């Protein structure tokens, strides 16, 4: 299959929210900041005027995470 597991599916709200590759690691200093890697993915879930908050894929940790640590693959559009 693809990877096991053992608990609940999931239960989360989200779509076509904006998506950004953290070019590399975010080590996390607030409670409310999360460790992110190099080449990570984060779903943004809250867009501040100087950061950017989501939730890691990875495992699902939601932090608050800069732009300058990650890079906007699609969602300013332009047309």
């Given at each position: 299959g693809s990877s096991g597991s053992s608990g609940w599916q999931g239960l989360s709200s989200k779509?076509?929210?904006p998506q950004v590759?953290?070019?590399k690691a975010f080590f996390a200093k607030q409670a409310?900041?999360?460790?992110?890697?190099?080449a990570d993915v984060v779903?943004?879930?809250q867009?501040?005027?100087g950061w950017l908050y989501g939730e890691r894929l990875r495992d699902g940790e939601?932090?608050?995470f800069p732009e300058d640590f990650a890079r906007?693959?699609?969602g300013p559009s332009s047309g």
């Open positions: 779509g076509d929210l590759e953290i070019t409310d900041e999360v460790t992110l890697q190099q779903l943004v879930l867009q501040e005027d939601t932090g608050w906007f693959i699609s």
